[PDB]
């Protein structure tokens, strides 16, 4: 493959440019095209950043891009390296997210972090080095889930009904940090995701057994605990011997239901790109296994 | 085609709770234009009974039956009246076919079978397929019921038609492995196609009837008494009269103020005037203009466009804030030194609407927007064109103007800027009548718009007949 | 009520040339005269909660 990529700069880089570009060695930067030679405009997310179009659009563009690790900069050349599956690399988190050991990491567009400064880097003319966020899986599928629930809830609601609920949904709290999702528009892509959610939920409701349906009621008759209280409360405002006992029916239905559940899960789950096992005690870099 | 099928199933799954029967409609160039067909965002429908009562409101009566208030503090009911109105409209599914078609060939090229009584082709530049529900409040359907159709566009503009259930059911009621509902719906097909007008005979649309509909199974009853149609016609008369009674209220107010003052008009608008002029012919031109304004006033008069932003939900709260702001106590020295700086008051320029009536070649302009500000030297008004240019019609002897300020103060101005000044009184209109006739549409979220409010929405949705559709 | 309470508390009428001298005081002003004699040094006043 094109194991190395040359990025050439058209703007002459000052002393400060070369310095700050050197400090960024091992940062994860994406390229759209996977070519041996590219120009600095194609580097990063700045080619696509567009706040009138939503967060989901930039998410869709990013999840299809090719990701690279920055290496030594020389005169007007930056030398990006593509990681390969199963090997071990040192990666840099320019994002404000905390990494704990053993985390599985995903790539997402940046979110709004409180201070609003966000450290603009390499503003050459009116180009800018907009790097993505390398986020651990829990926060990644939390943002994907909240974004889907905003799309699914706020349809056919007016702005007055919507306002407080989506204000509460946009804010995510993760490891004592606080982030906000920038532009959650109701895209065409988001409507496709919502349609897949509806079909998968219909198949869950249709093909579920009677055991899988009625377990909770029987446990509530048998048992009482805080978890069961919460589960009952979710069903409350809408709220016997089996007449068929069929292990083959149960196996057929369950092997189909797991398929539908994986379909519904893929709307929330992102692709793991790195897995960490060593974290610098200042949380500025990690040792990672590259995955794809 | 699929919208009719889905909507039939949807109204069946909801029938016990709602008792709304599914009415399948097709619209073409006889009801809407190509741009309006391509850019249509919502279709909403409303049910009103033989007594003029909407089915979203309380079955016996409402607190909106009381007269209006004339108070900006009340704003003709405020948020609660607005919410009672919004609850009254129900949203319908719709699909646009934006390229020229012939309806029967389109249905046959789909899965349907068509066995009409006479095979007359109907051709249409574009088609909108939508399903409305008319409410049989029991297993009984009256001919005096009317149904309202509303078409809405992305800027929030709407268009209302209304037709009574007698026109729709004039013929249809006067005559009265395992299978899937989809295949038998297609196989059973269509056998009726009827053209229906609205009450005022402005717009024609076609009704499509299917033999597989759950409508057929119910064997519910239909009736039309004479007295019920009479009362429904009277309610309709009261409905359309709402803007004209306001116009007459303003006319009587002008004549009453003119009697009270004795014909002495003080100057309220800036214009250098001469004594050596035949002011009597100006009075005669004023007579002709005030007759002609009544001759040509309409729904798009300045008075309706002035009351319409009052009916919006934010209006009452904002008016109360303004009342607090103007009557706020003078700040103490401590607040000026240490505390925050005071709110900026009202901007020097206001937005007004006017009716400009020229006599020489009889013409009246109605929905005219002007910007108004008081000149510093003398506190008279300067009326400017919304591009910032001074309006010249104060200097033309053959034109009079009626302005209505955003707080429902009206001026009637003669050449020279001598004006009659009084307030539009809403007390002749029940709160519900104004409120249902002229409340602005507020949008629910849809494809291609921000979840956050106030954002600059991106490229607006469109279905294109001129381009190969994107997917 | 004001005059009666001022008499009981032993306070004098609020003596400021209102407008400009009030702006001056709110900018900062040293408006308490000294006692004729001091034997116990500086007066450490008590603030009551």
mmCIF file of C-alpha atoms in Angstrom, chain B residues 19-167:
data_model
loop_
_atom_site.group_PDB
_atom_site.id
_atom_site.type_symbol
_atom_site.label_atom_id
_atom_site.label_comp_id
_atom_site.label_asym_id
_atom_site.label_seq_id
_atom_site.Cartn_x
_atom_site.Cartn_y
_atom_site.Cartn_z
ATOM 1 C CA UNK B 19 -64.094 7.845 14.707
ATOM 2 C CA UNK B 20 -62.546 9.517 11.656
ATOM 3 C CA UNK B 21 -63.205 7.981 8.269
ATOM 4 C CA UNK B 22 -60.445 8.130 5.648
ATOM 5 C CA UNK B 23 -61.053 10.453 2.708
ATOM 6 C CA UNK B 24 -58.536 10.093 -0.121
ATOM 7 C CA UNK B 25 -57.882 13.194 -2.220
ATOM 8 C CA UNK B 26 -55.870 14.178 -5.293
ATOM 9 C CA UNK B 27 -54.886 17.776 -6.075
ATOM 10 C CA UNK B 28 -53.659 19.284 -9.347
ATOM 11 C CA UNK B 29 -53.272 22.660 -11.068
ATOM 12 C CA UNK B 30 -56.901 23.472 -10.228
ATOM 13 C CA UNK B 31 -55.989 23.990 -6.550
ATOM 14 C CA UNK B 32 -52.275 24.823 -6.462
ATOM 15 C CA UNK B 33 -49.448 26.048 -8.692
ATOM 16 C CA UNK B 34 -46.266 24.216 -9.633
ATOM 17 C CA UNK B 35 -44.023 26.106 -7.208
ATOM 18 C CA UNK B 36 -46.538 25.571 -4.404
ATOM 19 C CA UNK B 37 -46.742 21.886 -5.327
ATOM 20 C CA UNK B 38 -42.967 21.434 -5.304
ATOM 21 C CA UNK B 39 -42.320 23.408 -2.106
ATOM 22 C CA UNK B 40 -45.345 22.232 -0.072
ATOM 23 C CA UNK B 41 -44.332 21.323 3.492
ATOM 24 C CA UNK B 42 -47.492 20.379 5.402
ATOM 25 C CA UNK B 43 -51.141 19.595 4.828
ATOM 26 C CA UNK B 44 -53.486 20.094 7.771
ATOM 27 C CA UNK B 45 -57.213 19.466 8.025
ATOM 28 C CA UNK B 46 -59.959 20.526 10.417
ATOM 29 C CA UNK B 47 -63.416 19.174 11.254
ATOM 30 C CA UNK B 48 -66.272 21.505 12.176
ATOM 31 C CA UNK B 49 -69.803 20.322 12.873
ATOM 32 C CA UNK B 50 -73.272 21.482 11.838
ATOM 33 C CA UNK B 51 -73.099 24.227 14.486
ATOM 34 C CA UNK B 52 -69.727 25.718 13.503
ATOM 35 C CA UNK B 53 -67.854 23.994 16.334
ATOM 36 C CA UNK B 54 -64.416 22.493 15.771
ATOM 37 C CA UNK B 55 -63.743 18.997 17.099
ATOM 38 C CA UNK B 56 -60.542 19.948 18.903
ATOM 39 C CA UNK B 57 -62.393 22.146 21.373
ATOM 40 C CA UNK B 58 -64.714 21.368 24.265
ATOM 41 C CA UNK B 59 -67.923 19.708 22.998
ATOM 42 C CA UNK B 60 -70.291 22.218 24.596
ATOM 43 C CA UNK B 61 -68.453 25.517 24.493
ATOM 44 C CA UNK B 62 -65.240 27.315 25.271
ATOM 45 C CA UNK B 63 -63.931 30.311 27.171
ATOM 46 C CA UNK B 64 -62.916 31.654 23.751
ATOM 47 C CA UNK B 65 -66.598 32.428 23.171
ATOM 48 C CA UNK B 66 -66.131 35.683 25.096
ATOM 49 C CA UNK B 67 -65.367 38.849 23.101
ATOM 50 C CA UNK B 68 -61.849 40.105 22.444
ATOM 51 C CA UNK B 69 -60.049 42.499 24.756
ATOM 52 C CA UNK B 70 -58.231 45.317 22.854
ATOM 53 C CA UNK B 71 -55.436 44.841 25.401
ATOM 54 C CA UNK B 72 -51.898 44.055 24.324
ATOM 55 C CA UNK B 73 -51.567 42.562 27.817
ATOM 56 C CA UNK B 74 -54.234 39.981 26.947
ATOM 57 C CA UNK B 75 -53.483 39.479 23.230
ATOM 58 C CA UNK B 76 -56.916 37.907 22.671
ATOM 59 C CA UNK B 77 -56.257 35.041 25.086
ATOM 60 C CA UNK B 78 -52.487 34.637 25.019
ATOM 61 C CA UNK B 79 -50.768 31.268 25.042
ATOM 62 C CA UNK B 80 -53.789 29.247 26.163
ATOM 63 C CA UNK B 81 -56.056 30.458 23.350
ATOM 64 C CA UNK B 82 -53.242 29.857 20.858
ATOM 65 C CA UNK B 83 -52.815 26.317 22.161
ATOM 66 C CA UNK B 84 -56.561 25.680 21.931
ATOM 67 C CA UNK B 85 -56.390 26.740 18.276
ATOM 68 C CA UNK B 86 -53.300 24.695 17.432
ATOM 69 C CA UNK B 87 -54.947 21.621 18.973
ATOM 70 C CA UNK B 88 -57.821 22.019 16.506
ATOM 71 C CA UNK B 89 -55.808 21.252 13.325
ATOM 72 C CA UNK B 90 -54.666 17.721 12.474
ATOM 73 C CA UNK B 91 -51.804 16.836 10.145
ATOM 74 C CA UNK B 92 -52.214 14.702 7.019
ATOM 75 C CA UNK B 93 -49.752 12.620 5.028
ATOM 76 C CA UNK B 94 -49.061 13.691 1.463
ATOM 77 C CA UNK B 95 -46.922 12.954 -1.575
ATOM 78 C CA UNK B 96 -46.266 15.102 -4.629
ATOM 79 C CA UNK B 97 -45.913 13.725 -8.147
ATOM 80 C CA UNK B 98 -44.272 16.748 -9.792
ATOM 81 C CA UNK B 99 -44.205 15.771 -13.462
ATOM 82 C CA UNK B 100 -47.177 15.749 -15.871
ATOM 83 C CA UNK B 101 -49.352 12.647 -15.657
ATOM 84 C CA UNK B 102 -52.761 11.271 -16.531
ATOM 85 C CA UNK B 103 -54.431 10.037 -13.371
ATOM 86 C CA UNK B 104 -56.042 6.783 -14.522
ATOM 87 C CA UNK B 105 -52.911 5.647 -16.355
ATOM 88 C CA UNK B 106 -50.888 6.417 -13.230
ATOM 89 C CA UNK B 107 -53.192 4.273 -11.113
ATOM 90 C CA UNK B 108 -53.103 1.409 -13.627
ATOM 91 C CA UNK B 109 -49.305 1.559 -13.944
ATOM 92 C CA UNK B 110 -49.218 1.158 -10.174
ATOM 93 C CA UNK B 111 -50.741 -2.015 -8.798
ATOM 94 C CA UNK B 112 -54.344 -0.814 -8.844
ATOM 95 C CA UNK B 113 -57.267 -1.938 -10.949
ATOM 96 C CA UNK B 114 -59.630 0.771 -12.157
ATOM 97 C CA UNK B 115 -63.227 0.018 -13.169
ATOM 98 C CA UNK B 116 -64.849 3.455 -13.318
ATOM 99 C CA UNK B 117 -68.424 3.899 -14.505
ATOM 100 C CA UNK B 118 -67.234 5.967 -17.485
ATOM 101 C CA UNK B 119 -63.592 5.918 -18.595
ATOM 102 C CA UNK B 120 -63.007 9.681 -18.811
ATOM 103 C CA UNK B 121 -59.323 10.594 -18.664
ATOM 104 C CA UNK B 122 -58.141 13.425 -16.444
ATOM 105 C CA UNK B 123 -54.746 14.984 -17.134
ATOM 106 C CA UNK B 124 -52.734 16.984 -14.658
ATOM 107 C CA UNK B 125 -49.407 18.803 -14.648
ATOM 108 C CA UNK B 126 -48.667 17.559 -11.126
ATOM 109 C CA UNK B 127 -50.470 15.621 -8.431
ATOM 110 C CA UNK B 128 -50.596 15.813 -4.643
ATOM 111 C CA UNK B 129 -52.003 12.672 -3.005
ATOM 112 C CA UNK B 130 -53.228 13.216 0.544
ATOM 113 C CA UNK B 131 -55.721 11.662 2.938
ATOM 114 C CA UNK B 132 -58.005 13.691 5.181
ATOM 115 C CA UNK B 133 -60.343 12.330 7.828
ATOM 116 C CA UNK B 134 -63.892 13.532 8.246
ATOM 117 C CA UNK B 135 -65.249 12.806 11.702
ATOM 118 C CA UNK B 136 -68.341 10.717 12.067
ATOM 119 C CA UNK B 137 -68.801 11.561 15.778
ATOM 120 C CA UNK B 138 -70.796 8.326 16.048
ATOM 121 C CA UNK B 139 -71.696 5.705 13.489
ATOM 122 C CA UNK B 140 -73.556 8.639 11.935
ATOM 123 C CA UNK B 141 -72.377 11.208 9.408
ATOM 124 C CA UNK B 142 -74.155 14.488 8.698
ATOM 125 C CA UNK B 143 -74.257 16.400 5.433
ATOM 126 C CA UNK B 144 -73.981 19.750 7.214
ATOM 127 C CA UNK B 145 -70.473 19.022 8.525
ATOM 128 C CA UNK B 146 -67.716 20.914 6.753
ATOM 129 C CA UNK B 147 -64.074 19.912 6.360
ATOM 130 C CA UNK B 148 -61.201 22.395 6.070
ATOM 131 C CA UNK B 149 -58.087 21.754 4.002
ATOM 132 C CA UNK B 150 -54.893 23.673 4.756
ATOM 133 C CA UNK B 151 -51.782 23.722 2.569
ATOM 134 C CA UNK B 152 -48.642 25.191 4.159
ATOM 135 C CA UNK B 153 -45.299 26.273 2.680
ATOM 136 C CA UNK B 154 -41.814 26.535 4.228
ATOM 137 C CA UNK B 155 -42.034 30.247 5.051
ATOM 138 C CA UNK B 156 -45.051 29.462 7.232
ATOM 139 C CA UNK B 157 -47.675 30.711 4.784
ATOM 140 C CA UNK B 158 -50.943 28.789 4.551
ATOM 141 C CA UNK B 159 -54.036 28.557 2.355
ATOM 142 C CA UNK B 160 -57.440 27.432 3.658
ATOM 143 C CA UNK B 161 -60.330 25.932 1.719
ATOM 144 C CA UNK B 162 -63.483 24.507 3.249
ATOM 145 C CA UNK B 163 -66.095 22.154 1.829
ATOM 146 C CA UNK B 164 -69.074 20.580 3.532
ATOM 147 C CA UNK B 165 -69.595 16.841 3.890
ATOM 148 C CA UNK B 166 -72.748 17.001 1.778
ATOM 149 C CA UNK B 167 -70.724 17.893 -1.327
#
